Symmetry: C3
Subunit: 431 residues, 3 copies
């Protein structure tokens, strides 16, 4: 009574002989690796052309010239850079506003007018933008740039490893979920072995706030998916930044007729150009910024073109091998396992240690919150299992469950384990 038939993988696909088999659906199993939050590196810049020598180089102190909302937002950004250039200083009077106070680095100006920004002389640059001064022309330029994290551009990313396509079948109305790990279905006619195509490899789950979008791969940061937020800003706890980070933006004062404007600014470069005012004692500012990676990411557009609504699976078909063989039924232990300890992390990519005592009566088909971690003979057991569920852990051999003792941390905590975050401070003492 041995038979063979091909079963297609599309909805509606079904075989009739010798035993009717219907394709009920297609899903997937995996070992989740939660990377936390990802976002593009968004270089944002602001500033002002000022026909004055301001005494307070800050968003509040420059409120009369610098756009209020962009200043506050860019000031709170990552790798902030700001420069205040004195184009034409006070000829007389004032308070630490003469040209002499604008030495390279502006320490003389900073003594009387403290600021978190760099202060530089720019005497020699065109002061033509500031007109309508009968005796003393005054001109300064402010530029501010940082990598701003836009909430609408932030995505939660879960990497899917050890991916297994689940071919959900109905074998004469009896549910059977086949994978490369478990390709057999018990049938009274005899065992059914399903020949399945290989698994699709690693997947990328982009979580939008809740909808999931799918990527196939690591991702590949060297191919068409180079602009993926995964290839950019990484925050494991959706608060603190880790790993690769661009340098602080390079701010430059570039006059309108400077030959440098014939070329484009490089990544992280911000060029500011004073615009001649239509009004007396006023001027505009044109900003040219070189974005990270040579392009600005448009998140809804990137997600729509670089992801799918469902995870990818091979086209099939599935090879249905109907056999006359009847599997030997082994006696299973149904009592819960004892003294179970779970140590490590979950959804992290590092297998957690699961140890305990398997009871008598047969092999314990051990589950940790419903997750199959293998079968163990009666007695002490030790296993390294990749867990997808958080603590508390309910442990079972197939029957009743028991509460295991756990010392398990979350993926964000794992990302900060083995590292000391932040500024490293040291003091050199006098002899």
């Amino acid at each position: 009574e041995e038979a063979f038939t091909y079963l297609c993988t599309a909805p509606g696909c079904a075989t009739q002989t010798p035993v009717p088999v219907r394709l009920a659906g297609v899903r997937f199993e995996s070992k989740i690796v939660d990377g936390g939050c990802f976002a593009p590196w968004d270089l944002e810049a602001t500033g002002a052309c000022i026909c004055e020598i301001p005494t307070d180089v800050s968003c509040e102190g420059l409120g009369a010239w610098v756009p209020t909302a962009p200043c506050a937002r860019i000031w709170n950004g990552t790798q902030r850079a700001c420069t205040f250039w004195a184009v034409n200083a006070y000829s007389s009077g004032g308070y630490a506003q003469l040209a002499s106070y604008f030495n390279p680095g502006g320490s003389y100006y900073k003594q009387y007018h403290p600021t978190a920004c760099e202060v530089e002389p720019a005497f020699g640059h065109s002061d033509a933008a500031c007109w309508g001064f009968p005796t003393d022309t005054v001109m300064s330029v402010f530029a501010l740039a940082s990598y701003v994290q836009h909430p609408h551009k932030t995505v939660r990313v879960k990497f899917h490893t050890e991916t297994r396509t689940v071919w959900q079948l109905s074998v004469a109305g009896v549910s059977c979920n086949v994978t490369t790990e478990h390709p057999f279905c018990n049938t009274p006619h005899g065992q059914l072995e399903v020949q399945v195509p290989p698994d699709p490899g690693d997947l990328v789950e982009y979580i939008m706030n809740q909808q999931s979008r799918w990527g196939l791969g690591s991702p590949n940061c060297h191919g068409p998916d180079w602009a993926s937020p995964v290839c950019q800003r990484h925050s494991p706890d959706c608060s603190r930044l880790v790993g690769a980070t661009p340098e602080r933006p390079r701010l430059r004062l570039v006059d309108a007729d400077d030959p440098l404007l014939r070329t484009a600014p490089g990544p992280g470069e911000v060029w500011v150009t004073p615009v001649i005012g239509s009004q007396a004692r006023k001027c505009g500012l044109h900003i040219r910024a070189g974005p990270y990676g040579h392009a600005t990411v448009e998140m809804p557009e990137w997600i729509h073109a670089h992801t799918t609504s469902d995870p990818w699976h091979p086209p099939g078909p599935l090879g249905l091998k109907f056999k006359t063989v009847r599997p030997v039924a082994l006696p299973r232990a149904l009592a819960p396992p004892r003294n179970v300890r779970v140590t490590g992390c979950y959804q992290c990519g590092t297998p957690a240690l699961v140890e305990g005592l398997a009871p008598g009566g047969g092999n314990c088909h051990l589950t940790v919150n419903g997750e199959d971690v293998g079968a163990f003979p009666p007695g002490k057991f030790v296993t390294a299992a990749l867990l997808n569920t958080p603590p508390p852990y309910q442990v079972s051999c197939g029957g009743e469950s028991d509460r295991a003792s756990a010392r398990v941390i979350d993926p964000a905590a794992q990302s900060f384990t083995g590292v000391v975050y932040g500024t490293h401070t040291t003091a050199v003492s006098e002899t």
Copy 2:
């Protein structure tokens, strides 16, 4: 008869019983991901030691001292950096050539002599290289560096995903191509099931221009293949640069006796040293450059040692399982599919959406330009398929073909989808 035999994977390998099976060849199937153009980061530098104070800091303006072809080529390079140092300026006369015009940043000089290059004073540096001046010694130094894309070093790269080794067999003269997805063959009066080793994982195809060279992996930029052009400069459309880019080169004027010369320059650093001239009012220049990645890539040499002429496959053997069973013949629809729409991209790594209507008379074994995308029951179908062929798309169920409606972009267009390329400009208005 129910029989088993091992078949080796080498040319000439063949088994005779119960039915002869000959290894006709070994090839591969994959889902192509075209990354476009890749090249190493080649830091190239030029310049000149000048016994004059030039008024035009450009390739044309410095034509009397700077080598012509290297200047023009390096000027057009990526992340260009250039500095003009005044070692010994005019003591009197001239036009914006006195020491006073060389303030830090050289804005006073630039006002009368515009240049895209940085201008800096260098008055405490040795002027010994410029001799033969009776009254006023004049000396300047020019340095120019960028990341030049050498055409002989540029490689077209296609990433191969979902790789399937194709074991081309001849079963009693009948062609059968076995993979992990399709391991069955028809024998005169039965069925052959071929046990195959796993697929080799992702491949890297280096396209020399036309010859193809093969890499096994992602590649791994952290191992012996670290210097792969894939790990470096990425241009998806073989014109515009994307992603990771080195900073602009750091140019330094370093005197012959400076202790800094006892150490090597870091990556992207360019040190220029004036060489005492054999002729009056003339001098040479010695350039020390720290290449990106601490080494200069020799492309024909790298390709020869880090790639193979053919894709890698496991050694085998193949397990030939001879069965008396015959597959159940299902009715196949031969009429072409109706209203087929193809949306997305090809050779991009994102599955394209294929939708239409499968005709009556059985399952439609759907092909998109000969590529198998699965079998579908009659009626409406929807599938996410990774396409290797460009539009137009010929769609078939196994018989006659029909032209499908398509909105499919190329891999280069996909790489620029979801991003806004180039300089981001913003204008700050006057109040």
Copy 3:
């Protein structure tokens, strides 16, 4: 007499019907890719606040103020950066110690006092830290930073590709090592086909030193929780020379105690130095704030303990035991050694090496290169591309006696430097 049973993967797991099958152990096979040495990017900084204008800006020359051991260690580091700032110079006398010698870049000072460090004026910065001078207050600041490679933080890393879980079985007292490549076993009068789960994909072997191996599952993924892996950082293929991605030279800044910049944290690679007012006359302390690479300092024993396992990972199973009455067709095999065998390329590198020679007559040669299976070949000329895990010399066999092959095979470190010219690229521009 067709039979089926599930075999669990735990040590001691066994089935008795129809043929006794015992799980002896679990091992793995792979194609090794030796990456050499890996370590975190450790930004280390030192310096001193000096109530003097030193004439020798070096560790020895600044021995009276700069901590001796940190100076020497940081000076020998990667991407070294050092700056000497003149806060308050000599008002009169001295030797190239006046304010005029401290022009931007300090070339005038450097003419008489050479140094590998940057020299900068800092005359508008607070000199309050240096007191007890009746006539001429003198003050300078030195800062030194680099990426120091700590030996206790350096790990040897071998990447494992084409990984195959080895299920070691005892089939009716006979050893059988089942993999996805070789899933068949002989039973007394039949054949056992073992259904196995897929292989776990690539592995990362972290080697510390006596010598202990720790295991990672993956590439690794530098974008997830294992971002701080030394593999994601400093790479030295020959455990001597650095290659690839390298941070920029540290950015040293002299930052006064009341500067608003101190309300923010320094960025990666940034080093901010702040003079501390001395409790003694003509002396001052220095406070250093450094932004580590990757925003955190890696603690190696702690990272390894949490981000690795003692053994490589394998799926939970069970294994599907398919008992058949079938017997494999015995093909005649050549036992004589292969001749004129040449091996070219590299080993433990990730690039298949070329193996060519002459297989003898009288059957297929089941070729081994230092015990490694590279496939079976019919009599005569053969050519194969094989990933080798063993170094030269190469002993070649068809299953019987072995012969010495001729080899032109380089090690993984040599492969990493093949196709590249290491170090400084020099060029000369001639006079016209």
